[PDB]
Amino acid sequence: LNLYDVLELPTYDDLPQIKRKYRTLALKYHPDKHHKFHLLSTATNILTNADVRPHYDRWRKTNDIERNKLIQKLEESESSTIDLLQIQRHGELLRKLKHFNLPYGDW
Amino acid sequence: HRPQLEARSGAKAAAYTPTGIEHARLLPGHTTLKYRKSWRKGTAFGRGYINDMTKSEYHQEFLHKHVR
Amino acid sequence: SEEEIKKFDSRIRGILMASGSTTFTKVAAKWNTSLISLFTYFREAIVA
């Protein structure tokens, strides 16, 4: 579950925006009015400092990875899709001599 | 007194009262969905896709035959 | 030959589709003529 998923909220927010997010959620899901908030407190802890918020978000992306896999599969699929006579003849000649019985040359 | 100039709006049929006749084709069928997871010499002689229906080759084969 | 077999069959179908109400007698002559013509030209062959 994502921190965004836990709060039931949507996904570069500022340190200010981080504070405002908590404030908005607090109004909605105020624990004193209505375990989930544990997540909110932690993520807010880093989000309230813009640095932590940014780094945390730094590390949908995976799904993009799914797109990459699809692309690889497509590339593999499309690109891929996109003397004897003399020998038998010589053998035929060789048998003819054997039939005629004429001595074989040292082949 | 001829042709369509319009079509009939289904809206009209939406306001009528139902009759409730039972048809043959609405009887239950497929009732369960599926979810996914030297002689020769003496003679006188001898020694591609167009897009259209009428001018194609198959057509001239056709009419070349069936008309005899 | 297969062709003229099909021509015969097609002719009988002719009498059928056409003689919706042409009377029995008219049909019979038409049926006979095709038959006499078919046998006589091939007389011998038809047996096989």
Binding site: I87, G91, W107 | - | -
Partner: protein, 83 residues
Amino acid sequence: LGKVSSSFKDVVEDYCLEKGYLISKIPNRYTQLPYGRDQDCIVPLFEIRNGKKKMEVALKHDILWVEDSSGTFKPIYLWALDL
């Protein structure tokens, strides 16, 4: 050519005799054969030894086929065989 009484295999045998190599039938084993057509023939194969070397030959039409190192038979000239 149909007229000619003699059969190849015979020729091969004759050739082998001069070499002193011995050709043996090998009953079960067979190799899929690629010939001009986009189809592969199946033929039984035999192995010829000069002393104690075994190599395997399958002849279809009028030709001798010897397998390439990775695998799959390649046609070769009769003079072109030395074991």
